[PDB]
């Protein structure tokens, strides 16, 4: 299937007036060149292959950067650097989020890929053996780790991936996991109805998707015990929507995001550059 060919047409002198319409109807303009000019025949062999939803979304996009370290931790703050937890979302970054938000609703499977990098913190503390990482998916309700070596990492039921530093970026597929018939990119509502004369506080409650969304937690640790040399790591998380359906198109984000909602920032709401004149080529 190809984009439209142009038919051979000459002029008209007619009560047929395809050049005029009334967009008050809610219909866009429909006229094509053959309606308003003399056209030659042009066979169009070109296709819209690369603008299908699968093609538009068919890329692994970085959605977050996590940090973990491996060293002899003697304080609470340093113990908390030995592992990290991240609420799974696409809202830490802007590029994939903006593409998804052309649509109100979506349904897709997810390919998740990880890029893991290390550096030495210092040069005077000897060396470090090759590190193994555990990335544990903690679904809502499953116990979250409070230490890098607590019981939760035995991961009897949670999916974990063990990654050996220097090996191919680890990768797994996630089904469509939504509890609705599609994911909502926008939710015009609340998680509960506040009722007349209730004692529950209405002053610090939130609005929209943030009140209802929960895709669980990614927990990451270095499985190795500490070397004399402190190693600091970054874990880049990549998402690719696949087997994609989307509904109800939206205008794309025109101004910077300032969080997980649709809110905008007072110093960043002037996207257009003023032209010198309405007559500027």
């Amino acid at each position: 299937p190809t984009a439209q060919s142009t038919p051979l047409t000459s002029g008209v002198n007619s009560q047929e007036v395809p050049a005029l319409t009334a967009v008050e109807t809610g219909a866009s303009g429909q006229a094509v060149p053959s309606d308003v000019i003399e056209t030659r025949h042009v066979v169009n062999y070109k296709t819209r292959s690369e603008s299908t939803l699968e093609s538009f979304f068919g890329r692994s996009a970085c959605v977050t950067i996590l940090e973990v370290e491996n060293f002899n931790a003697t304080t609470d703050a340093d113990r908390k650097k030995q592992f990290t937890t991240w609420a799974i979302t696409y809202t830490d970054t802007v590029q994939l989020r903006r593409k998804l938000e052309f649509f109100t609703y979506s349904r897709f499977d997810l390919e998740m890929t990880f890029v893991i990098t290390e550096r030495y913190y210092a040069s005077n503390t000897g060396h470090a053996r090759n590190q193994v990482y555990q990335l544990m998916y903690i679904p809502p309700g499953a116990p979250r780790p409070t230490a890098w070596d607590d019981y939760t990492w035995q991961s009897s039921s949670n999916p974990s991936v063990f990654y050996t530093y220097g090996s191919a970026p680890p990768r797994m597929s996630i089904p469509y996991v939504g509890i609705a018939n599609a994911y909502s990119h926008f939710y015009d509502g609340f998680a509960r109805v506040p009722l007349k004369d209730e004692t529950v506080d209405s002053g610090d409650t939130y609005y929209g998707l943030v009140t209802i969304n929960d895709f669980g937690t990614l927990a990451v640790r270095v499985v190795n015990e500490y070397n004399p040399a402190r190693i600091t790591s970054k874990i880049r998380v990549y998402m690719k929507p696949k087997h994609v359906r989307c509904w109800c198109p939206r205008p794309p984000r025109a101004v910077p995001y300032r969080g997980e909602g649709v809110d905008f920032k007072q110093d960043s709401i002037t996207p257009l550059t003023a032209v010198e004149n309405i007559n500027t080529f």
């Binding site: 609705a180 939130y206 109800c248 939206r250 905008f264």
Partner: protein, 264 residues
């Protein structure tokens, strides 16, 4: 004889006429319908109130002035206090509805102006504090039939507690997108030289078969002056805009005692 400009709509005991229409929009080309057994979720026999609730309710009119920046409503919020529709909505945990939206604005052959009338699924709007995100009170999000107005200025509050309302900034459609692109949503235009009414028929739109109407608005209704009202003999003249909405194919599940939402 039959004309794109002349239309009658009857639902229940209510009829609308227009002699200066511009066709009618059926959002996404889909007429509303009842929920099929093969797409159903809650298993209790639903209430289908039919003519008691599936009828035209006329909201309080608003005044279009040369200085108006626009108006918004949410659905089903705008109809929550409307006759038996409101009672069925609040006596049930779950509800679904389509709508016929009829926006009315007549003037004269000497007036000029154009209203964009947009039906927006999941019309999420920005909050009015930069101390927080997604920080809107239930009461400010759900104004009912009075709806709200757009502004051409964004003045977020000093204190988080004072900014728990929408920053309904007209040119960003109150949600960080350019208003010029609102035409991707089901719409008509009331251009005073052409037409005096807009008609949008809306199917139920959601990621679910049925949902909590008291928690969740499925549609926003936005009326934006695309071209300002002008009238040479009196630039300060006002003409009413009247919004009349009929629920359609309403279905409710999970009957219990009545929901009475907070008012402060």
């Amino acid at each position: 004889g039959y004309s794109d400009r002349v239309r009658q709509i009857t639902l229940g005991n209510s009829t609308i006429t227009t002699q200066e229409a511009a066709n009618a929009v059926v959002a996404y080309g889909e007429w509303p319908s009842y929920l099929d057994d093969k797409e159903a979720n809650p298993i209790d026999a639903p209430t289908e109130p039919d003519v008691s609730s599936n009828r035209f309710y006329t909201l309080d009119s608003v005044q279009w002035k040369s200085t108006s920046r626009g108006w918004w409503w949410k659905l089903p919020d705008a109809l929550k206090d409307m006759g038996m529709f409101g009672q069925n909505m609040y006596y049930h945990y779950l509800g679904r509805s389509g709508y016929t939206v009829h926006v009315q604005c007549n003037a004269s052959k000497f007036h000029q102006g154009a209203l964009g009338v947009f039906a927006i699924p999941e019309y999420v709007m920005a909050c009015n504090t930069e101390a927080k995100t997604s920080y809107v009170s239930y009461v400010n999000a759900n104004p009912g039939e009075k709806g709200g107005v757009f502004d051409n200025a964004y003045n977020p509050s000093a204190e988080a507690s004072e900014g728990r309302k929408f920053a309904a900034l007209d040119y960003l459609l109150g949600c960080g997108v350019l208003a010029g692109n609102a035409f991707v949503y089901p719409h008509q235009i009331i251009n005073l030289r052409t037409n005096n009414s807009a008609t949008l028929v809306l199917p139920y739109v959601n990621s679910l078969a049925i949902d909590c109407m008291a928690k969740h608005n499925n549609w926003g209704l936005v009326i934006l002056p695309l071209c300002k009202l002008d009238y040479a003999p009196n630039s300060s003249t006002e003409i009413p805009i009247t919004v009349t909405i009929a629920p359609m194919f309403t279905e409710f599940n999970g009957l219990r005692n009545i929901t009475v939402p907070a008012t402060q």
